[PDB]
Symmetry: C6
């Protein structure tokens, strides 16, 4: 599920909120990802460890089918 | 079976039972379990949000649901 | 057994002992251990809730129970 | 032994030294180490409680104890 | 696959970074080296940061990865 | 590995360190020994610190890990 969901967000350039386990809310677009990290683009590309993410919330409905 | 987690989540998914998902930082999410895999649960309410299982403390059904 | 964890939880399950499960954020869950697998514990109170072991700090029986 | 844990915790167990186990949320537990396995430590006071190692930050003996 | 090129770009360009930990605390410095498990972050001393404790690595200015 | 040379230099040079835990708590002492799972940190007693609970190990003064 992870891969089609993140790929849809990536492909469609959908703004997302990535909530971290620490409660911090990151915002941007998903640039790329692998099994361990997501690169989130805003003013810079930042590397987010999946182990530190609680939830990825699209700003609008997007199909992952 | 070897897994209890899988029949539990599947029953909640199949019966479209509203759940509360409490995260390790105490935040509460709500919705219906749309799908899940080894690492994540897709929780539906206004959008589908992808919740990492490693960030979940407990999944609490809003009403009794059989997982047998 | 091969572990302490399995006979400890099974003794609590079999004897239907009320327990407290303390989560890593500090919150206290209470109920009886219905079942468990490698990753979760099902805790019964008004509903069965699924508790991820990764989110648990301790399991405390409400009264001494032998795990031997 | 397959980690420094093993002799350190076994010394504390065999000598029945009171310990503090500090958890990842800052909580301090106290008791004696009854036993441990790959994933948990059983900590004895009035009851045996099961403490998941993943939730522990430190184990601190109340007085010096050789682990050699 | 993505961590190596991302961290190597920051290392070779000596770009100041912010490393936010799983508790939300921000460390700052330059990436000196890294392996599968840790990042060595230099400021006044070299400190060793466990990747398991990192949420996000944020360059202070855009850097191509 | 970078961990092993870094921690071994601190151990051998008996450099006081600060170990910051994942909850932000600061421990101080000297590194007595370590393996893949724990660091034994000495002050008045030897305490066993799980590496899974550590965020950072910070030497109190510069030490070469080369």
């Amino acid at each position: 599920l992870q891969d089609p969901f993140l790929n849809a967000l990536r492909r469609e350039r959908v703004p997302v909120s990535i909530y971290l386990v620490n409660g911090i809310k990151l915002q941007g677009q998903i640039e790329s990802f692998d099994q361990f990290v997501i690169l989130l683009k805003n003013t810079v590309s930042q590397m987010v460890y999946k182990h530190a993410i609680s939830t990825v919330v699209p700003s609008r409905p997007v199909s992952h089918h």
